[PDB]
């Protein structure tokens, strides 16, 4: 019941013939899985951890210059020389200054000048790389037990926590009363950590693109470095000035921390202070329900009277949660629960909290159900004393199908080809849709890499216009431009 | 500056909100709009040149938008 | 960022060397070069689009240059 | 003789009927003036001082956040309110957060959340404004006295320093032995300090455009503010993060010192530590030579022998300097000095140090002269013992006319229409030329404001191409095109 | 009489109205000057000294490597780091090597490797630069005194040595018995030592083009350098081998001394061991004969007999030398000397050793004369005992004219437009030829700078073929091609 | 190598004999001559290509001479 209250909640219905279903668990999201005669389960990916990061590169973001020395040379007599030019701790530059009798030079003309100052890093940021085998994902599996304090409860020990590492494809959890859930996840195909860097600056951290990180114009040390003083391209952090060709000075540029934050705009903030913790990305998992069992599948029906102890509340996804309490005898028993039409003729609503049971009489039960659009009767208990609760559900099936289409589109915009795995039962149309998405996505990704969302919108308008003024090409370009436009509206940057 | 090469368009975006998602959204367009509001004479010239170079109204509007966008970025 | 609105084109320049003049002269030309080398796919898509939209070769090359310069 | 050695040295020849000449003095440059009956004077604008500056606004470049406070509302109950949303010491933001039974809420849905944090500037930069009336320009006037230690000497008291203010902009300098020089400067038309800010960051200072300074996307205080509790646009230096629509937090962005250094790229650095000293920009002056007089013009010519005590040396502008010492009697006397062909038939070059004299026998005399291109002979003294020194000057007159044309073109690029004042004697062609340049300078200075040199090169090529393709309109656009391409090549940013 | 025996010998005859004649003195050449009532003189530039040379650059020709260190890095973990990379004494190279489990690495792929070695110069070469005012030319002026041991004597004190420097146009020499010779020379236009470098390798020295010297691909130090260790472009003298992507080794390349001897092919060798001594190049001089008088004109003709003590011998230029001893009384006296036809009617040849005299009876006298082509008779003394010596000269005026045209064309090839000054009295057809030569010489020098003689021959044939297959263009190009072919045949490299 | 950049064609030649003037005179000719005798196959391909590229026998001979001279020099 931990999923109840999350806006980014998905409902995966049904398993394959082999009683499995594929799900993709995202951070900040939550998946509720339902299958016929199986317990409903809530899955949340709550933690991704990177272990044993190697340092790829340190970058200096705040430096200090000292020991500024300069040497001149009369015109036509070549380059000046400082002894400090042999030391790479010194940033140096050769310029020209006017020379003549007034400068102690028997000749007139441009003479060579060299300025050297010792470069010292004050603050640096570190780029760390982690091996995919060193990832560990924490998934929390909370069943729909109806327990009193379980609705949207992410603090208590209602759910089971499991660790998903590449060191074992199978992760099993014993859910007390529900049998065992088996998950086979893909910790190597989530975020591609071979293409990524864990960038730690002062007290914050970001997950960044590795090649972008290696192109940052700052002074750097290789991660292998130990001296901490032989900075590469220190010139990106200093500036020499020869205002009137009379004298050359050098000054360190200011701290680039604030500029790095501007540079980090479209990256995802992570934790690196005490452990490398990531709360972003997804985990594709194959959920195996074979060893799952309805808790209290072997209970008789409750015959006594129920009372509502927390009034029906609608969630953001059109389901309703109610808390009820059994007053009768015979606990533990199975709660009678039905959503019916106004005639009390057709059953109209499916349970989410499947097989709701009373375990202790004085312990109330939370029951999530999905009513139909329009009016309906939530029927609880048997006669006499049956509760007949009226509920109206706003919306329509047409509006729901449109909202399902957009969520599906948004899942593709975020997951890419992995979105075809999301509720997948190994069907043949899903493997085709995935393969065509992989080739179209690879081509699309090469063509729109690096551009901002405003550029994708401009290009989408351009391509759509080249199709509207074109033929089979006219539907292709209009389709490509419209998907491009949609992705520019959906992408964060 | 590193601020000139931001982490935009890298293909690592998840459903999680990125570092400066709100600011990195409309800053460029606001920077363009502030620039045009400070340099209307270049925009008039860019409009004049776009009209002269473009043979069709789609080309002219595309040349105008690009010139106007390029100019505060080239700085 | 203040770094995105530099003090360029203000008509205050004297014969005196400005602050990061030698550095900041080609930094945008080197930035676009790094980006084109990192993202050839867009530059290839920019060429095809500049070819299709522009009629004359001057329009094509101008659209291509502008597209390539706006993208990074 | 101070000008000798400077590469940005300009030779202005000829006075008007009124015995005056208009000169422009640029920082880092220097002007050598000479008229027919006048002594040669060197002019250098060596100091611009801006006095009594008022702070326009302080910008915050490094802040810290403290006292973070959050308030939440349940869904459908609108936005929550913190007391700190009315405290201007706090930056605040509203967001949405999923609520439900697990969050202590009776409903499910997006609840409003507001996060506030107290804003404390740690480091700021100050932008000061000076009134044009508080400018003080220092000009040093060095006569070509031939004095031994005067060649390219700025570390001495050879020349006379005049101060020029917008109130006392006409001043006279008594040049001992050379009469009186009068300078009528226009210190209100060189730089427009009503449009400029003296921007002081930590230990460095820049002269920056006022409207650009006010458009800086950083938190700011008015110049009167003494407390620092009313920072305007604090949101530019913070970011609010709501990663998973679950919890909002606010973090201070890093120090913007290095981003401000990037922002200051095409601005000119100044000094604001020992007073507001500018070593950039120009001063236009009318030089009055009426009361100038050549020194020792009643002297008879020396008849003794001279010896070279410092060999002839060519300067960067095609002139030579030589130091000779007198060995004869009759001091003070005029030095016989000519530049002739090998047979001494023709006079080939002229003096810069007009009327060179010997004041004391044992004090060597420095003499600057302009030899012709090619072979020439510096003849010093009269026989017996006459000095005859061979000199060859590389280059030609045609190449000199190209260098003079480029030096004038570059001056119009730097000074705009003020370049028409540089050696003006008040003619009609100069007035007409300056008036047209003021108009084309307005139409150009509005069309290209805010544009980089690369954008000037591109537009210059585009404009040139339109001219080469469409004869009245064709020559006009190719001229605008090639002038734009020149100004893109010449500008610094 | 010092010219007598030199193959590169020239006879300059006649002076201008101002009693001067321009001559060009080359190293290894010699000039004999004649004028109607003047003594005959011999002029030889025998020494060019450069003084006070500054070191422009040192170049390492032989190095050694010591202290070789290497460091590797696992694949995807960035670059390895050696501390020696900070010291610029160390040459370093980054490469890639196969890494894997056998190499102690947890991953497979290309890992970074860095190799460093200490670079030490064993032998270097220094290029020195001299200022044109620090050149001293030594000219020996030898009168045709007829002295016994004067003919071709370069090891004696027969002439007067004069020192020509830029510090004085006029050089004057007392010729005892011949008055005074005045020379106004052009030391600043002999060689352009501002474009030249005095290159000193182990024990030899060359005069080299400065830009060629600055482009030498070798490790260098500035002439200002005093430490001797911060060598620039050290990698020009080392190689890094990574033959199988297993291991990177660095080795030093061999001594480039022999390779530098190949590079110095077209250069002229000088002496820098004990002072910078040059025996190459030329000096243009104006020779003033105003104060030259013949010696012994107030003597009477000799009356006694003469005997030939060294038989007549022809020089390479069609002059003859004879040594006679006076056997009579009345010394000092004038030797009766004519060249006549067999009938002693017509005077056929002239004296080179004009006014030959016996200074002492026992001292024999050498007399140079130019006989006509064919039969001539050398009449020495008077009767009784008058010597009458038949001489035959082979050749003709037509052959002497052609050899003169080849000597003048050869002088233009070597001296360029300076050849027009060689026997110049100041005509306007010499002034126009010299100015035109300076124009075509500048266009030719720019067009054929850097090409070898075989390329000059190729281009000459190609230009001639273009001209041959072109009327006005045909003559103008066949002529350029023919001159290009002649210059390609005459140039030493 | 420095040997590849000889001090040839620098315009400092005097009447004085230069450092390896007799030696350096025909080295390049002798070097090209030996090369043709060791690599006659390329000279045939050079002749064939010259005949094909050039229209006139002056173009063809020039292309053959230049191609035969470049071949042992790009090495
Ligand atoms: C187009 C209508 C497709 C309707 C539909 O299936 O809605 C969604 C599919 O939407 C799409 O495929 C995007 C299509 C964009 C329409 C243009 C289902 O999304 P999902 O939850 O990720 O898939 C899990 C299913 N077990
Ligand atoms: C026909 C020109 C023949 C001629 O004048 O001979 C020589 C000139 O030679 C030339 O001008 C070359 C003309 C090439 C024509 C074939 C005299 O040159 P010089 O030896 O330097 O005489 C200097 C005066 N003492
Ligand atoms: C009208 C609205 C247009 C609806 C757009 C349909 C959804 C497109 C979303 C999508 O697939 N985005 C991209 C995701 O890439 P990323 O997250 O960066 O790894 C995608 O990779 C690029 C282009 C979309 C191609 C569409 C593939 C569909 C294949 C269908 C085969 C059956
Ligand atoms: C070949 C091309 C080189 C020719 C250079 C032409 C000189 C134009 C330079 C120039 O004055 N540029 C600008 C300087 O602006 P600023 O110094 O920042 O106030 C100028 O103010 C704007 C446009 C150029 C107008 C030149 C018109 C010259 C009028 C001549 C009257 C006849
Ligand atoms: C039969 C053909 C013999 C033709 C001999 C023509 C003499 C040309 C010699 C010559 O002056 N060569 C060159 C010397 O080069 P360099 O000493 O290294 O500066 C020269 O500087 C370049 C071109 C020579 C143009 C010939 C100028 C002719 C002057 C015409 C006035 C009458
Ligand atoms: C830099 O200056 C400090 C100041 O005394 C000095 O101790 C130190 O040796 C200097 N460093 C170098 C490398 O010269
Ligand atoms: C969450 O569950 C824990 C565990 O029993 C409970 O103590 C807590 O009160 C619950 N919180 C809510 C909001 O239901
Ligand atoms: C900020 O926090 C400190 C420490 O709790 C407190 O003393 C101070 O009063 C707080 N300021 C505000 C405005 O709440
Ligand atoms: C400059 O003039 C001062 C004043 O006499 C003198 O002391 C100093 O030596 C001079 N400097 C030079 C470089 O001539
Ligand atoms: C180089 O090696 C020698 C031993 O051969 C050692 O004594 C010396 O300290 C080393 N020098 C450096 C700079 O490593
Ligand atoms: C050259 O002159 C010197 C000086 O008299 C004399 O000793 C020597 O023998 C002479 N040599 C010749 C070859 O005439």
Numbering used by the authors:
A (entry chain C), D (entry chain B), E (entry chain A): 1 to 470, 473 to 495
B (entry chain c), F (entry chain a): 90 to 164
C (entry chain b): 90 to 161
Please share text taken word for word from the publication where this structure appeared:
The E protein is responsible for attachment to target cells and mediates fusion between the viral and cellular membranes during entry. During the transit of the virion through the secretory pathway, acidification and cleavage of prM into pr and M induce large rearrangements of the spike at the viral surface, ultimately resulting in antiparallel homodimers arranged in a characteristic herringbone pattern.
Density is present for ~150 water molecules for each M–E heterodimer. The bifurcated envelopes can accommodate a phosphatidylethanolamine molecule (site 1) and a phosphoceramide molecule (site 2), respectively, with the fatty acid tails pointing towards the membrane. The two sites are located on either side of E-H1 in the stem of E. Site 1 is closer to the membrane and is largely open with sufficient space for another lipid between E-H1 and E-H3 as suggested at low-density thresholds. Site 2 consists of a narrow gap between E-H1, E-H3 and the top of the C-terminal transmembrane helix E-T2, and a wider cavity accommodating the head group of the putative phosphoceramide molecule located underneath the ectodomain of E and near the stem of M. Using site-directed mutagenesis, we show that most contact residues are essential for the formation of viable virus. Specifically, residues Arg411 in E-H1 and Trp420 in E-H2 are essential in site 1 and residues His437, Gly441, Tyr444, Phe448 in E-H3 and Leu489 in E-T2 in site 2.
